[PDB]
Amino acid sequence: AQCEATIESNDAMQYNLKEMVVDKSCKQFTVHLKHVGKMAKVAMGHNWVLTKEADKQGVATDGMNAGLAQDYVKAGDTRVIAHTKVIGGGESDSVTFDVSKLTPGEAYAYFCSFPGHWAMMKGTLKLSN
Amino acid sequence: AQCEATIESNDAMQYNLKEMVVDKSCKQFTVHLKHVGKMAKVAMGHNWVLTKEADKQGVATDGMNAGLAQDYVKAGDTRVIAHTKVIGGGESDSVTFDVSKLTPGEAYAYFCSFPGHWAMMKGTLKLSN
Ligand SMILES: [Cu+2]
Ligand SMILES: [Cu+2]
């Protein structure tokens, strides 16, 4: 139902959710990302980035090149639907986005853009009723 | 006996050895790194890099900026005692170095300098006793 979801990231380099569903009644959707580990952001920071599935690699690449001060996301990347900041163990961050950016029936990829994390930290997001 | 060791790396971002000992009877030592997972190097490439414990973070930071083609290790890095190339699943690489670069009693760190892997893929190397 409600237009929110909580996802956990840890020191093992995993998310705890592999799929997220945004209910069709939602106009706004909020993702709460938590880092439940204890490692520093420079060593094991995590974020949550949303792109079309297609755009995964590219956004990941450019993000890595953007640096930590940019939360490992190329500024103004248009391929990026929404993203959180990079957070370390014990922290959390939230992002709220307009559902209208998503198109029904389409596949969206969410992943962590911190260097090298995208390969193990990825999931699918979809709009459904 | 031998002045050689095999160390495995996998898709879970781990090495299978946490510590390595080089026998004092050795003049040279060879490390054979194997990537026994099935991920490709662009997503989960691994290397093996040896430095003094203290040069870890810096070598890693800078190897990261050298890129894949440079095996994620800055060329001519004086802090690097030895390193293999970056390999992907189903591949192996070997590196041999002089034992005399080592100092009896000292703990050296070995780790994977591929983006983001250092936090998890790290161990200790030293001389026999
Ligand atoms: Cu991450
Ligand atoms: Cu690695």
UniProtKB/Swiss-Prot annotation, chains A, B:
Q: Which GO terms describe its cellular component?
A: periplasmic space
Any GO MF annotation of the entry: copper ion binding
User: Which PROSITE patterns does this one have?
Assistant: COPPER_BLUE (PS00196)
Give the matching SUPFAM superfamilies: Cupredoxins
Q: List the disulfide bonds.
A: C3-C26
Positions binding Cu cation in this chain are H46, C112, H117, M121
Key words of the record: Copper, Disulfide bond, Electron transport, Metal-binding, Periplasm, Signal, Transport
Q: Plastocyanin-like domain location, by residue? A: 1-129
List, alphabetically, the InterPro entries matched.
Azurin (IPR014068), BlueCu_1 (IPR000923), BlueCu_1_BS (IPR028871), Cu-binding_ET (IPR050845), Cupredoxin (IPR008972)
Which CDD domains would you find in this protein's record?
A: Azurin
Which superkingdom heads the taxonomic lineage of this protein's source? Answer: Bacteria
Where in the cell does this protein reside? Periplasm
**NCBIfam families, alphabetized:** azurin
Job description of the protein: Transfers electrons from cytochrome c551 to cytochrome oxidase.
Q: Which PANTHER family does the annotation name?
A: AURACYANIN-B, OUTER MEMBRANE PROTEIN H.8
User: What's the protein name?
Assistant: Azurin
